[PDB]
Amino acid sequence: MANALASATCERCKGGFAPAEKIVNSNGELYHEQCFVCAQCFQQFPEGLFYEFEGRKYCEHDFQMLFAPC
């Protein structure tokens, strides 16, 4: 019978989610809340809030630190 009704894939792990399961859209690209990982904190970001800068993604907090004084 076969099956594999996969569709839509992580924009970072390339996984394939059923996307009302655990897929996260940010801007228009899909990321697993597993792809929601701080490059410093790339442990998954709590409550899922993330901010992307210069090819690396940091919670805003760290992003400002690289992007601005402290």
Partner: protein
């Protein structure tokens, strides 16, 4: 429009060398955050202009103000070539930042098998185990490659005889 800084990354590798020839040696100023020209250059990808800089006297064992060694940024860029000559200068892979992130952790975080090999090709050991075991083996066992897993485990891990010499030998 960051003047020379913006025009420099315009790919005009000639424009960055142009101001880098400061006959007064001052324009070699980093940024308010302490970002060094080498730092920005490391992620740019113009191996030429940066290569010469490293020869001027800039050391690779430098930590950005946020705490980030060029080794990380280098692999976090994706330029196989720069990595080889950048990681073969001092091999400071055995020198992580403050979180412990090893160049390999980042190398696989993006997807660079080749460079990842040259890293453990020294002894970094791919089975290091970050702070919670967050090592490429897991990030590689997720996609389900199995290709680099066998090559990784075929180095000395899958066929591991029962270790001993530390339980029943004395008391």
């Amino acid at each position: 429009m960051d003047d020379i800084f913006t025009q420099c990354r315009e790919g005009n590798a000639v424009a960055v060398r142009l101001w880098l020839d400061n006959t007064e040696n001052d324009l070699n100023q980093g940024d308010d955050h302490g970002f060094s020209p080498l730092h920005w250059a490391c992620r740019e990808g113009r191996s030429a202009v940066v290569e010469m800089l490293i020869m001027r006297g800039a050391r690779i064992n430098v930590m950005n103000r946020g705490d980030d060694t060029p080794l990380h940024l280098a692999a976090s860029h994706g330029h196989r070539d720069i990595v080889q000559k950048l990681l073969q200068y001092k091999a400071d892979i055995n020198a992580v930042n403050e979180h412990g992130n090893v160049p390999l952790h980042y190398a696989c975080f993006w997807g660079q098998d080749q460079v990842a090999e040259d890293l453990v090709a020294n002894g970094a050991l791919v089975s290091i185990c970050n702070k919670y075991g967050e090592m490429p083996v897991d990030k590689a066992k997720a996609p389900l490659r199995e290709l680099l897993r066998e090559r990784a485990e075929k180095m000395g891990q899958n066929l591991n005889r029962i270790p001993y010499k530390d339980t029943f030998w004395k008391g």
